[PDB]
């Protein structure tokens with residue numbers, strides 16, 4: 001029966017703050033002039049940072065926890081990954097998908113993630129994973145708001161009954177329409193697939209999230225069609241272009257021309273640093289390109305960009321604990337957003353920007369919003385990132401749904417000394 | 424009441440010539456065997472060069488004299504330029520446009536330019552500059568034949584009511600249909616915009632002049648659609664592709680294939696050396712590309728190419744005195760047309776080739792043509808270019824409309840000595 005969050009630090013704000021809770025919502029936020037005493041019904045943030053929940057804007061829960069089954073992706077490429085997944089997709093069962101999705105979802109709850117957008121492969125006449133994921137969505141609702149993207153992994157026009165299956169997925173309840181233009185047989189199929197994707201999103205009033213130009217091909221420019229169609233339909237807010245790794249390889253003049261449209265369109269962008277650094281640059285010898293989209297430039301231009309984990313122990317990525325601060329750490333390094341302020345502001349890439357990408361309507365520490373927030377045992381975004389701190393408490397609807405008792409390290413010198421890695 | 428131009432040198436001809444004038448036209452041209460005596464009603468070219476008037480095939484009189492208002496183009500790019508112009512376009516007034524256009528037109532008259540093609544931005548529902556320019560066209564007619572290009576600066580398909588405004592501009596009297604495919608949101612809009620541009624030109628019987636591929640993007644190939652559509656409609660002579668700076672970055676094999684079509688199509692090309700060297704190569708670090716289209720190769724292939732000033736003290740260019748010999752000087756250097764003959768023949772790039780680009784029907788020193796010609800105090804094209812000579816006399820309809828008394832330089836050595844920089 002929590003009534004208040006006290007001694008809280010807030011990004012971009014000076015001092016400590018008190019967050020009053022009432023009926024599962026935030027009733028008011030007031031600044032404090034000093035440290036407040038703890039008491040019953042008060043959750044002490046202990047001068048730690050309080051922020052809305054971490055968000056996972058791009059993950060594949062249907063493939064999670066399947067790395068090496070039946071075989072391993074030896075080349076470390078997107079293309080072999082799809083082929084290795086195809087082998088596993090043929091062996092899927094309802095319970096298998098639910099068990100694995102839930103295992104990763106629990107790690108996400110433990111990591112303060114209360115909003116997740118999972119893509120689900122719908123290039124499968126049986127739609128096995130989709131049916132399973134729709135049940136998981138209902139089951140996990142008390143802890144995570146899960147969005148499902150109908151993702152035509154093998155193409156819309158390049159796979160038998162691809163468009164029909166994509167629409168069937170929407171009729172069954174998928175929240176977002178997906179696409180993968182660079183994987184279609186031809187550039188023309190790629191462009192046409194986007195017109196079909198947008199028509200379905202308008203027909204069913206759904207969001208859009210395209211696996212867009214995930215390839216080191218300077219000629220892969222499907223992103224301009226995604227942005228142009230969004231601008232034409234006046235629906236930028238509901239549209240997302242995931243990856244756009246090809247943008248890392250575009251010449252600067254085209255990119256500058258393109259950026260005007262990206263900003264005017266208002267669409268969202270997702271970069272997946274852990275997976276992008278691994279799968280991109282695989283066709284170069286030396287030097288080897290990084291392959292992440294132009295994150296730094298998007299931020300400088302006011303274009304909404306955010307980070308996703310993409311994969312957790314599957315054909316496209318053998319690692320992960322579904323930790324967003326870890327995803328952010330990799331992104332800041334590869335994108336060279338290493339200035340103090342850029343690092344400190346990094347939290348935006350895994351909180352607010354991701355919420356906008358998911359078109360969330362109830363997100364942020366503000367009066368009237370649901371009492372969904374997490375507490376990090378750190379002074380600010382920089383500190384949280386540097387020390388890769390766990391989530392001390394995760395609060396949803398005004399109730400604690402996860403907590404982590406921090407590790408305790410001691411070094412035995414002339415006398416025992418506690419080490420917290422702070423300066 | 425001039426009756427004859429005597430002691431004239433002509434490009435590509437040996438000796439001196441006499442040009443007889445009658446009723447505002449050239450009645451006959453006869454070679455002289457020696458120097459002729461001056462007399463009343465005879466304009467003595469004094470063994471200087473006589474050529475048809477200089478031509479300005481590409482300039483923006485609606486933006487001229489506005490550099491820095493309200494702000495300066497800090498990046499020196501085409502893209503920021505459009506954005507800086509957009510700010511100024513919002514502050515345009517009828518008289519403002521007329522005053523500035525006239526200021527530059529007077530410099531052009533002083534510089535022996537009697538034919539000018541100005542682009543006018545018609546991505547403006549009020550069409551303020553266009554209405555002003557249509558009046559300027561009538562006002563300046565006694566001295567300059569002004570062609571107006573309806574230029575959809577912000578795109579045809581990418582700007583609200585862009586196509587409607589473009590057609591309205593033609594209905595109001597614009598002589599040429601413009602376009603800017605590389606600025607459209609997508610490659611498909613770019614190609615479609617060209618089909619619409621050609622349809623309007625045929626519907627109204629107007630010329631075409633496209634701002635074509637003005638970008639350092641090796642994939643910007645709208646020029647092939649411009650040339651193909653012209654060939655299909657059998658209208659090459661009436662079509663111009665301005666800039667084509669992307670051609671500077673094409674691989675050689677595609678360029679060779681393309682050149683066959685360029686020659687067969689018969690379309691015209693305009694290079695704008697002063698502006699191209701400034702705006703192109705801005706996305707390179709080092710080495711930095713020059714960015715002018717393939718002028719030297721076009722000349723070698725018999726493809727009509729010419730030079731324009733493009734901008735005079737505005738968002739895309741802070742300098743200029745609207746001087747064509749200066750434009751030519753820059754072009755010869757950057758394009759490496761530095762052989763004696765190439766330099767001497769350089770005048771063609773600012774006279775005859777530009778007249779063909781404007782589809783002029785009354786141009787050249789020939790019997791029957793209007794008596795429009797200028798006199799340069801130089802021995803040939805090479806000499807005129809090297810010394811950047813002024814226009815001694817500009818004659819139109821057989822009357823002097825401009826004259827420049829040359830500067831007089833003296834050095835005071837053991838005795839005073841006149842210096843004319845000749846060898």
Ligand SMILES: O=C1NC=C[C@H](O)N1
Nearest residue numbers: 060078211214310316
């Ligand atoms: O096409 C893809 N499938 C799964 C992961 C990666 O994001 N790309």
Ligand SMILES: O=C1NC=C[C@H](O)N1
Nearest residue numbers: 483501634637733739
């Ligand atoms: O698009 C353009 N507008 C003005 C000058 C330059 O020629 N390009």
Ligand SMILES: [Fe+3]
Nearest residue numbers: 060119211310
């Ligand atoms: Fe993905």
Ligand SMILES: [Fe+3]
Nearest residue numbers: 483542634733
């Ligand atoms: Fe121009």
